[PDB]
Amino acid sequence: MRMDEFYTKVYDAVCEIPYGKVSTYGEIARYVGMPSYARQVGQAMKHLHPETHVPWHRVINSRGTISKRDISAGEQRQKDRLEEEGVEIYQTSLGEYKLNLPEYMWKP
DNA sequence: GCCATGGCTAGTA
DNA sequence: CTACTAGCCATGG
């Protein structure tokens, strides 16, 4: 398959995530048949228009924190967002916004 | 072909 | 817990 089929399946995946639940970069890689594309799971997310109806904010790193998303602090945005779905998040000695994965993970 | 970038991740230690 | 490899693999130059 090819990179736009790929980008579509991933957005059908993500779209599936129940409000107020979450999933992992890596899991979706797996779910769409692409067990080793976790990194490109990241970039599909990275490219969305900021219009999108796709819940990119329900996607996190497989330790259950929010990805440092380097280029600058902006992914404040992801947390402020997941808290809008009553998800609970706390913090690390050292930044790492973070959560209870087993509680919020979407296990379908 | 190269390289340097990255919303990644099991392993290690 | 935190760091650190080692793999992974598309992009854009």
From Swiss-Prot:
Alphabetical GO CC annotations of the entry are: cytosol; nucleus
> Entry's SUPFAM superfamilies?
Methylated DNA-protein cysteine methyltransferase, C-terminal domain
User: Which residues are annotated as site, described as Arg finger, required for nucleotide flipping?
Assistant: 39
Give GO terms: molecular function aspect only.
Answer: catalytic activity; damaged DNA binding; O6-alkylguanine-DNA binding
Q: Which UniProt keywords apply?
A: DNA damage, DNA repair, DNA-binding
Q: Does the keyword DNA repair apply?
A: yes
Q: Where is this site: Required for phosphate rotation/nucleotide flipping?
A: 25
| Record flagged with keyword Chaperone | no
Q: Which InterPro entries match?
A: ATL_DNA_repair, MethylDNA_cys_MeTrfase_DNA-bd, MethylDNA_cys_MeTrfase_DNAb, WH-like_DNA-bd_sf
Q: Which GO terms describe its biological process?
A: global genome nucleotide-excision repair; transcription-coupled nucleotide-excision repair
Sorted alphabetically, which CDD domains does this protein's record hold? ATase
Q: Where along the sequence does the record put site: Critical for recognition of O(6)-alkylguanines, probes the electrostatic potential of the flipped base to distinguish between O(6)-alkylguanine and guanine?
A: 69
Q: Which family does it belong to?
A: Belongs to the MGMT family. ATL subfamily.
Q: What does this protein do?
A: Involved in DNA damage recognition. Binds DNA containing O(6)-methylguanine and larger O(6)-alkylguanine adducts. The DNA is bent, the damaged base is rotated out of the DNA duplex into a hydrophobic binding pocket (nucleotide flipping), with Arg-39 donating a hydrogen bond to the orphaned cytosine to stabilize the extrahelical DNA conformation. This structural change in DNA presents the lesion to the nucleotide excision repair (NER) pathway. The affinity for O(6)-alkylguanine adducts increases with the size of the alkyl group.
Database matches in NCBIfam families: ogt (TIGR00589)
Supply any other comment: Does not have alkyltransferase activity. A tryptophan residue replaces the cysteine at the known active site of MGMT.
Q: What is this protein called?
A: Alkyltransferase-like protein 1
Which source organism? Schizosaccharomyces pombe (strain 972 / ATCC 24843)
